[PDB]
Amino acid sequence: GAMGSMERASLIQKAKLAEQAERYEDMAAFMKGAVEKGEELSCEERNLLSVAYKNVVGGQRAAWRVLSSIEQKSNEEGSEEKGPEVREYREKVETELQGVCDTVLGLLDSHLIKEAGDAESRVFYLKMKGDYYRYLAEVATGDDKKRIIDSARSAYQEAMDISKKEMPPTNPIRLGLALNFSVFHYEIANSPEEAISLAKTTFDEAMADLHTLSEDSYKDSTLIMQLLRDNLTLWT
């Protein structure tokens, strides 16, 4: 690893600098280096890892969507043939996106998930595993799509089961997991009713637990509760 010669603490420090500079590729590379030191990540460090890769793959997804839309228009009736270039460049972006997803899933499998015993960390990493399989599913077409979808579902489901047993309904990780699993149901798994049911049940049970939620998590949890409401408004 190109980060093998750097101190773990220095990698964490530089990941925080990269975040301030909105250099998310660097941020992800520093956090990958930190993970590869072999020690568990703290709560704050987990958030650096997730934000870095969320932003890298988020930009790739946005670009992939632009290109896929151009490609689909280029394949409509009456559209002029322009050659292989749109497909080629969409494939280039897609392959880069898949590579980043594979990198994240590899970190989770080697060895973040296996060593995570506290509910917070275990749910956090399994949510990430579902997220990155979901991003693989967004671009999957061949004999692989159904297994990729199943892998996303399996990771989200294990996270869900742990979160409901070990976390209060207002826990931000629990809430964010439910938000994203509900989007998985709506956008990936062709299950809008399950998506709506999950979002509503999650929102309602969090509302009833707010009379105990922290001022620390309030803004995160209210943000996510509002995102659940936003999605329900989009869907109904």
């Binding site: 997220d131 938000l179 994203n180 989007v183 709506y186 956008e187 996510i224 995102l227 936003d230 989009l234």
Partner: peptide, 5 residues
């Protein structure tokens, strides 16, 4: 697109 976190 719907919101995720």
């Amino acid at each position: 697109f719907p919101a995720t976190v």
